[PDB]
């Protein structure tokens with residue numbers, strides 16, 4: 296679990312969005328596993344606007360942060376799950392690191408701010424949904 300709180304927006308994994316997220320929907324994209332909802336309180340986070348390919352992410356299943364080198368956002372095949380059919384997930388970045396079911400929502404940050412959130416994993420890999428291209432989050 297986990298979310299990004301920026302301005303009057305809450306960014307979550309689309310498959311973990313609550314009834315309240317859907318009732319306050321701003322934008323969602325099944326191909327990216329992202330959903331953004333509106334909030335009444337001002338958020339605590341800031342978004343990176345950069346091309347960093349190194350950063351640190353929070354891994355809930357280890358209660359620890361790990362440094363990672365990750366690929367640029369791209370279209371990557373993801374096997375079927377209870378949440379989605381087998382498909383290509385867009386704007387996804389991969390890295391070598393631990394991730395298991397429950398780790399989705401962990402934040403990846405670089406020196407500039409929040410880069411994205413955990414969305415995939417397994418076999419010593421961790422995948423992050425990028426948010427750096429969503430410029431409207433800043434206004």
Ligand SMILES: CSc1ccccc1CC(=O)N1C[C@H]2C[C@]1(CC(N)=O)C2
Pocket residue numbers: 310328373376378379384394395396397398399413414415416417
């Ligand atoms: C950290 S998630 C994970 C890790 C190891 C093993 C299995 C998982 C679950 C997993 O792949 N999931 C759950 C939900 C998000 C999704 C992938 C996707 N973005 O389409 C569907």
Ligand SMILES: [Zn+2]
Pocket residue numbers: 343344345346347405406407408
């Ligand atoms: Zn950066």
